Design a protein around this ligand. Sequence first.
Ligand SMILES: [Mg+2]
Ligand SMILES: [Mg+2]
Ligand SMILES: [Mg+2]
Ligand SMILES: [Mg+2]
Ligand SMILES: [Mg+2]
Ligand SMILES: [Mg+2]
Ligand SMILES: [Mg+2]
Ligand SMILES: [Mg+2]
Ligand SMILES: [Mg+2]
Ligand SMILES: [Mg+2]
Ligand SMILES: [Mg+2]
Ligand SMILES: [Mg+2]
Ligand SMILES: [Mg+2]
Ligand SMILES: [Mg+2]
Ligand SMILES: [Mg+2]
Ligand SMILES: [Mg+2]
Ligand SMILES: [Mg+2]
Ligand SMILES: [Mg+2]
Ligand SMILES: [Mg+2]
Ligand SMILES: [Mg+2]
Ligand SMILES: [Mg+2]
Ligand SMILES: [Mg+2]
Lengths: 147, 362
Amino acid sequence: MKKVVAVVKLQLPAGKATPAPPVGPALGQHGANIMEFVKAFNAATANMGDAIVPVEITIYADRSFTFVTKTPPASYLIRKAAGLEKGAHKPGREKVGRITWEQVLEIAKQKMPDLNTTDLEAAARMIAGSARSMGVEVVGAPEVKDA
Amino acid sequence: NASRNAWKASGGIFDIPQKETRLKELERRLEDPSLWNDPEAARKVSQEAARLRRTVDTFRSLESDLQGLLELMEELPAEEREALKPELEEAAKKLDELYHQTLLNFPHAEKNAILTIQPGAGGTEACDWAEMLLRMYTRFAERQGFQVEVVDLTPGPEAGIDYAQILVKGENAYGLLSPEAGVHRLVRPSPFDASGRRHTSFAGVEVIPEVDEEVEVVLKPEELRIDVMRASGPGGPGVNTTDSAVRVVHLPTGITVTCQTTRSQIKNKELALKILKARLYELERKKREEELKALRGEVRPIEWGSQIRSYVLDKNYVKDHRTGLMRHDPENVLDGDLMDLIWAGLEWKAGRRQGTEEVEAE
RNA sequence: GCCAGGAGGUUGGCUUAGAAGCAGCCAUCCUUUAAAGAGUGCGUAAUAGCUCACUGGUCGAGUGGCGCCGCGCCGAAAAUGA
Ligand SMILES: [Mg+2]
Ligand SMILES: [Mg+2]
Ligand SMILES: [Mg+2]
Ligand SMILES: [Mg+2]
Ligand SMILES: [Mg+2]
Ligand SMILES: [Mg+2]
Ligand SMILES: [Mg+2]
Ligand SMILES: [Mg+2]
Ligand SMILES: [Mg+2]
Ligand SMILES: [Mg+2]
Ligand SMILES: [Mg+2]
Ligand SMILES: [Mg+2]
Ligand SMILES: [Mg+2]
Ligand SMILES: [Mg+2]
Ligand SMILES: [Mg+2]
Ligand SMILES: [Mg+2]
Ligand SMILES: [Mg+2]
Ligand SMILES: [Mg+2]
Ligand SMILES: [Mg+2]
Ligand SMILES: [Mg+2]
Ligand SMILES: [Mg+2]
Ligand SMILES: [Mg+2]
């Protein structure tokens, strides 16, 4: 059995937290006790560092929530080899970085279990793709080969 | 540099307790669902949240460079103590941002500025003092990194200036010279006085950026109504049966005008319009005055006591009567040392009297 | 036309108080798979909600777009009675 009245998508660092918006109106118009509900948030952020961990929320009818922490956006991978905190204003002409075909492969392993996409071969095009439209183009070597 | 620390540090400290209580009354207002329903009324609400960024950032940056810096530095030649000095070299870099983000918030602080000097109470020595102030702000510009052009200047009978005006180029030209408003006071034995006793002399100063124009856009066809009617006076049957007179009233401004000096309707309709143009230009120049002259100063007697900062060369001491601040070098200040004044105290009290007026009752 | 899904990473990068396919700027991944476009319109403060696009079923015979020609429709209110 289960119950849900209205879902929502929120984000926050993996440890720190503040009641201010956009998280503000969220835990205020649906109820969310920081006396016990947040203690389920610090348990999965004590050993783990900090990141763009987007909690894929799922509010119930009884004001409660589902603290199932999901993986960070595929854009969190590009600003990991580079270190940027933004992105190009025009994905196509200019270029804010040049993460090689290898960077896209190593940290992308973290994204497969949460995603519904198949093996690491399939989880490879998605991350490079989430870079084709954020001002950057990869560089590789093995590639096609073919007959 | 330990003399300006507590000045800039405590400068961002008095905003802590005040904004702390206010942002709390707002952040809890952003919760209830019934609040956002108000259209643009709710924008003014979430707006104050956009200020909890330019306040909490100092609560973290200024507080960290005060807890860590003040620790390891109390005594040591150059080992681990002088090594902690470069650690806060960016503390002077970040000091620039907190200072800037409280000056540009003026009306037109970012753009250039015009500064007119004119002598006052103090006889011909006052007429001589004005040139001193001109030569003060002039050097203060180059050394600030500004460019200067004397828009106008007129030498006095024996002194050196009955009037002068100088346009300072560069960003924040209006920002820095803002607190330079009002009449300054000079004290010294008069070089023109035979007995040479100690006389006082004054001089006013003013600052203002720049504007533009709009002559033809006013005479939009949609605004004024044009009337036709037979003419008074001679003509024959032609005058009786042919209306050539014209009445071009400006609907909004109400100002009307009539013409009929020529036999033609078009040449009257034409003249009556060139006439309305002249009057509407003289009506726009009157209103162009309050919004380009009230900015100068709501008073400024230039008399005695109308001053805001005295420069005594006898005992060698300037003194800003606004901040109560004092000093001991009138000889150098009247050469370019305005930075020490404008920076810490001047812009402060200048924005203070208006920054305490809005955050309380106005 | 009607029954059902219409999604996942994704909440696209950036601008911005907010821009969650939906003010604007720049744009050219994959996958559960039969199919669903980093998105047609509405709905929002930002979302959820509705729909097309597309695929499945049913039905059971035609249907949709574009160019050309003929005649016609609107555009079309006045002062003595038509
Ligand atoms: Mg949802
Ligand atoms: Mg109009
Ligand atoms: Mg008359
Ligand atoms: Mg005659
Ligand atoms: Mg006649
Ligand atoms: Mg006639
Ligand atoms: Mg006639
Ligand atoms: Mg049916
Ligand atoms: Mg359906
Ligand atoms: Mg349906
Ligand atoms: Mg489906
Ligand atoms: Mg579908
Ligand atoms: Mg549906
Ligand atoms: Mg992509
Ligand atoms: Mg998509
Ligand atoms: Mg949706
Ligand atoms: Mg609904
Ligand atoms: Mg045709
Ligand atoms: Mg035709
Ligand atoms: Mg025809
Ligand atoms: Mg009709
Ligand atoms: Mg008739």
